[PDB]
Amino acid sequence: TTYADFIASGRTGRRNAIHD
Amino acid sequence: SVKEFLAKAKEDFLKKWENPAQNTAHLDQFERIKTLGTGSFGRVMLVKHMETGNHYAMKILDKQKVVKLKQIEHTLNEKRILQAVNFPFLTKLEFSFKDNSNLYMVMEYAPGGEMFSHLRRIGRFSEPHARFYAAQIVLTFEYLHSLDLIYRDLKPENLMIDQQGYIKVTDFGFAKRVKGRTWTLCGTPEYLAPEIILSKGYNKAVDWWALGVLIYEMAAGYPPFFADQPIQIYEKIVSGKVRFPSHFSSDLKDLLRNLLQVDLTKRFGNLKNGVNDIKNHKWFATTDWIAIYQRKVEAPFIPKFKGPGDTSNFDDYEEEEIRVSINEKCGKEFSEF
Numbered sequence: 001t002t003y004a005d006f007i008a009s010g011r012t013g014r015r016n017a018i019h020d
Numbered sequence: 021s022v023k024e025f026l027a028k029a030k031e032d033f034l035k036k037w038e039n040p041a042q043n044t045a046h047l048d049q050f051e052r053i054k055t056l057g058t059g060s061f062g063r064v065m066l067v068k069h070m071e072t073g074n075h076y077a078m079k080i081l082d083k084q085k086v087v088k089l090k091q092i093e094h095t096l097n098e099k100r101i102l103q104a105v106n107f108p109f110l111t112k113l114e115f116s117f118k119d120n121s122n123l124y125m126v127m128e129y130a131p132g133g134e135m136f137s138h139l140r141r142i143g144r145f146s147e148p149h150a151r152f153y154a155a156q157i158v159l160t161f162e163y164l165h166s167l168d169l170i171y172r173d174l175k176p177e178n179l180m181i182d183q184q185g186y187i188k189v190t191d192f193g194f195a196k197r198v199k200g201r202t203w204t205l206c207g208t209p210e211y212l213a214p215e216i217i218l219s220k221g222y223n224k225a226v227d228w229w230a231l232g233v234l235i236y237e238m239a240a241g242y243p244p245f246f247a248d249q250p251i252q253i254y255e256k257i258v259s260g261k262v263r264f265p266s267h268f269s270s271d272l273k274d275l276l277r278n279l280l281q282v283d284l285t286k287r288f289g290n291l292k293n294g295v296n297d298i299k300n301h302k303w304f305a306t307t308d309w310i311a312i313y314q315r316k317v318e319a320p321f322i323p324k325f326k327g328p329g330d331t332s333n334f335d336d337y338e339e340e341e342i343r344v345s346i347n348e349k350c351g352k353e354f355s356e357f
């Protein structure tokens with residue numbers, strides 16, 4: 001399931017901003 | 021009318037924009053209570069103001085760290101904008117000041133925690149639940165955009181829940197007053213519009229794209245474009261394909277197709293009819309926009325409260341010192357702050 005794939009991913013925590 | 025309200029709002033804003041408030045408190049007027057969030061872009065602390073006993077959120081930036089990240093101008097933007105705005109779903113600056121080491125911005129404390137926390141724990145929000153929050157973002161963006169402000173970091177991590185279950189859009193570190201196009205690569209990977217990823221000049225339409233991502237994530241429980249690394253995320257975003265969960269209503273799918281639209285001539289929020297394309301969409305049919313603004317609508321979720329200055333809705337972070345050097349750092353860089 002897509003939910004299972006999300007929960008197993010390394011990006012379920014707080015996501016940082018990006019920049020140059 | 022809307023146009024009348026915004027006219028008056030702009031007059032209020034511009035007076036503060038052209039004459040920003042500066043040095044309106046001092047660190048020693050506050051008692052530090054708890055770190056509410058922390059990262060490379062500074063931290064937010066719960067503090068108590070001694071003279072009144074009022075609680076506030078105090079954002080603290082290390083001037084030297086700001087310089088190393090090349091965020092000087094962006095930081096001056098954040099402070100200049102936040103001291104000038106006033107809106108039910110924003111936390112304007114109550115005070116700001118600086119010392120030898122740090123920059124301080126003091127604003128209303130939202131005790132309900134980050135949307136991020138509740139969304140992840142609960143898993144997803146019902147469509148009416150998602151819609152209640154989305155409505156408040158739509159109005160906030162209508163406000164900010166009319167002031168020529170672009171926000172550029174919509175996400176659950178930057179949406180705070182107040183005691184009544186309404187939202188505050190916080191974290192204005194990438195907010196900018198710009199009338200034309202702009203070019204800075206900034207935002208958060210999951211929420212970046214195709215224009216940004218492809219290094220084009222872009223405009224406030226990136227905020228409306230971001231709203232599409234938020235609404236999706238709120239209703240689905242995961243974002244429409246996710247992967248283990250940013251690069252894989254950008255490939256998905258530019259691809260021009262999104263999958264919706266089967267539980268998504270027809271109206272929700274249609275709103276999202278029109279928000280997550282790579283083609284700027286068709287993206288809702290950007291078109292001739294502006295924000296009314298969004299406000300008048302079938303998904304918002306039950307939304308009383310004035311009732312939302314007036315905060316008369318009953319929130320579908322209200323955070324658990326146990327008293328004033330309670331912090332149980334926030335995670336626990338290691339408490340670092342607030343160090344103040346005896347030597348002034350970066351004085352000229354931040355002289356207008």
Ligand SMILES: N[C@@H](c1ccccc1)c1ccc(-c2ncnc3[nH]cnc23)cc1
Binds near residue numbers: 058059063064177
């Ligand atoms: N998005 C976080 C955060 C993490 C690291 C650094 C800076 C910010 C965050 C933003 C705002 C608050 C916040 N909480 C409570 N009341 C507030 N008013 C204004 N901002 C807040 C808490 C965490």
